Symmetry: D2
Subunit: 241 residues, 4 copies
């Protein structure tokens, strides 16, 4: 249990990739604050964390709202007695050519994916810096490494996360806090399904990656003092940049 | 005059890098619509375009406002009779550690730098696609290739522009429209001290100029088979 | 013991980064074939692998020589009963401006760092592909991501490893074999290293154990391939 | 004529991409030393340079041989009276999976593409440095940005050129010499491969020697661009 005695916050932690990361960190010894917008899913995943022998707390958090993000950090400290790892895994996606993108489409993806990550990171800094050790783990995407047609807004938001991660890493490099990004390739969940199915043919391994894969990378960052500023692809070979 | 008969819109075109790009493209034969928020500067740069023998139009445009950006495209078509090149060169910057960044700081830089570029590109698509040829040129930054401490928000916005550029390039690759980014290194104007220190980090040890950026803009505007690229003009600071 | 029952070859495994990787993989359950040119160091590191409760084999290998590299793979199959992981960690460096580089300087670094990695990978390929499972792990450098002045030949060789890695990963992507690179930053010529630490945001060197941790990650990640991951305190992220 | 009075060496300059670059630089005012192994092609291309009103010199050069590369640089100084631009555009390719690659395959591609570029650059340094101005332009490939399956050796060699370019740019950054790379996409067994690679080009068409010459002219006239490796590839990669 490398993470015994530690506390992790996972935004978007109730399902999909966030759940995978939470359950992996919990398996490795961390108590978890799950932050999401899905009430039943939060409860279910909390039960799974507890089934691993860990403590779990839940927060209803819209990551675009600074007050909710601050309260989330305050709750980890109050309910679980600390904070060591912040995983920003809240994310939204839609598929439209730029010609068909509305301002709402643009703002939604940029605000949740990029601004939400900024707000989460900012909220955790004072505590992590004061304790002289911490792990910030942002979940971007391979769409943060390559521009995807009909996902230009989503790519912009994920590129933003990659760049934000690297810059913040450099700010905190002498503070004992590492900052890294996980870049998932295709993690399964119709236009979206048809798109997903086609993208798999472009993956050299020809198969999707899993939430558990992402959790393994999160656990690696969480236990590597000398890795910071990186954006690592878990994508079956699609890109290596 | 490689761009003879063509029309370019340059947002942020009244001063700095935008002006440099505008005057380079005008020197190369293009008539220019200058879009910015500075009235006297717009007038002055318009006079410089006309002094080169070109026609110039001016628009007062807040690139965060879609209606103004649409009107801008409409004005190039109405006043100058067409549109061939769109240069998105509106940009803002501030220096703060993330711990000191406000939401206003984040939103200002992201909305001007990234959303403004999205809105500009979107407004020009219908026309450029219809005529089967076009050049979209986004001005990012080397901060779109490397995260800069105390500029994390600025880096996010410029990374966004690089990614957006590449994605849009792929959407338009069979439409005859190329989409590329210019990534300036250090182009002069806390800010001064920061600028001065960054120069020591440039292998050539000197700043780059608006004219350098204009030369890259002219290259993109005259290269059919280059698209999706983000080329650094930065004295060797980064090559990614 | 995630690597229980598996066999790893580690070239350059007698000392430094190679040794760190060998000991991490051995700690995680792998039996190790150590390949190097240092006899006493080979014996000492073999004893350390055995002290971890693992079996160890030793091969005297010049990685620029295909016959030796091929025999190394054959020895793993014969002495340890199989092969699951190949770590190419033989590497050499010298510091000269291009103006002062000799052909010998160029060929030495390119043959050891790049051609040696090609030969190792090629030698292990048939077996890993036939069994439908395998891990190939190349040790490049951050100098494979950024050109270093007075190290242009060294950068050329490590860029070559990064590109070779990605290409081979794509060839084997449907064969159950992953191919990845470890890119160490500065692992404690001495004056140069001290000067390079100014370029590391964390302001400290990385360790052979750090690299061993990344090797263990690659060795246990089915769905990561073609990657070149930097362990470098923030120096580069490309 | 932005390059009026200047002298350029173009290795591999007798045909293909090298020829395109030579003619663009000559068109822009430079006198040219063409270095290659093709006798008839060298003569033909030299006549084309002279038809542009420029002077042309010819050298029979194997870029893997240091003495020949040194003689090439000396010939530019002696025959054309100077040297301002070096274009390293000698290049070879073959297609084999790693499982089928021979040492001969590996060495051929690495020695010509990478070592030949090292040798070309090294031979020109003393002169370019002494005059405080110069342009070194290496021709890599998009295979120097992405690993290509069945071209692992070729990718290795072109990745090497990209890294070498960036490193050398940093050595010379205060010497008035810029060092950059041109990365061509697909420029028209090899033919079948090319046809398949076009599926990977967003624009769906190949690029031309003239495209590469245009980028060469750009580098040759941009003081403040150095260390870069710019892709001319219809959108295949932007890294
Ligand atoms: Cl699948
Ligand atoms: Mg501290
Ligand atoms: Mg059309």
């Amino acid at each position: 249990a490398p993470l015994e005695g530690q506390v992790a916050i996972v935004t978007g932690g109730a399902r999909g990739i966030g759940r995978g990361i939470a359950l992996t960190l919990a398996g490795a010894g961390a108590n978890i604050l799950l932050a999401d917008l899905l009430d039943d899913a939060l409860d279910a995943t909390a039960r799974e964390v507890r089934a691993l022998g860990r403590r779990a707390a839940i927060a209803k958090v819209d990551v675009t709202q600074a007050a909710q993000v601050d309260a989330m950090v305050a709750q980890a400290l109050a309910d679980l007695g600390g904070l060591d790892i912040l995983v920003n895994c809240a994310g939204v996606i839609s598929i439209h050519p730029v010609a068909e993108l509305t301002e709402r489409d643009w703002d939604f993806v940029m605000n949740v994916n990029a601004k939400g990550t900024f707000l989460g990171c900012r909220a955790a800094l004072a505590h992590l810096k004061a304790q002289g050790r911490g792990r910030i783990i942002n979940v971007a995407s391979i769409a943060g490494k390559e521009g995807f047609p009909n996902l230009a807004h989503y790519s912009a938001s994920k590129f933003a996360v990659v760049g934000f991660t690297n810059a913040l890493a450099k700010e905190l490099a002498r503070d004992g806090v590492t900052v890294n990004a996980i870049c998932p390739g295709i993690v399964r969940t119709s236009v979206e399904q048809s798109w997903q199915r086609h993208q798999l043919t472009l993956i050299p391994q020809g198969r999707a990656q899993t939430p558990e894969d992402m959790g393994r990378l999160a656990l690696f960052f969480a236990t590597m003092d000398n890795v910071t500023g990186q954006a690592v692809n878990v994508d079956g070979g699609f890109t290596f940049h």
